[PDB]
């Protein structure tokens, strides 16, 4: 718990400087100390996304979701994990899948950023 979060935060610091190796490693240590926290897994998903590895990001988002449905109290992080899957489709121009996943996210927790990203995709899709 305590050290887990100090591991996550060093990872966070690394990720923000695009030091993805270091982020992943600190995220791993965080996950070994507290396997039931889906945030570390969604954090790794973010790393793979910024690497261009959209597929791994989605895989990791899916795992984060199974861990969170077990917690049962984590609707907002579940929401984040779906919107990250949406984002990863959006990046590949797979807009129908992007939109579907934003709707999943919003249904969990409505947020403005995710609503705005959804409307962007709906407009692109409309006008195609």
């Amino acid at each position: 718990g305590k050290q887990a979060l100090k591991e996550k935060e060093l990872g966070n610091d690394a990720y923000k400087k695009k030091d993805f190796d270091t982020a992943l490693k600190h995220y791993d240590k965080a996950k070994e100390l507290d396997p039931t926290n889906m945030t570390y897994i969604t954090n790794q998903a973010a790393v793979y996304f910024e690497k261009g590895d959209y597929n791994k990001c989605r895989e990791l988002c899916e795992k984060a979701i199974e861990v969170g449905r077990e917690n049962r109290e984590d609707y907002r992080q579940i929401a984040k994990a779906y919107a990250r899957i949406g984002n990863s489709y959006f990046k590949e121009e797979k807009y129908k899948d992007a939109i579907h996943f934003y709707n999943k996210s919003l249904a969990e927790h409505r947020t403005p950023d995710v609503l705005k990203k959804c409307q962007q995709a709906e407009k692109i899709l409309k006008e195609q």
């Binding site: 966070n12 945030t39 973010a46 996304f49 910024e50």
Partner: peptide, 8 residues
């Protein structure tokens, strides 16, 4: 330019 995915 490009927005970065946010870490928690």
């Amino acid at each position: 330019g490009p927005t970065i995915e946010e870490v928690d």
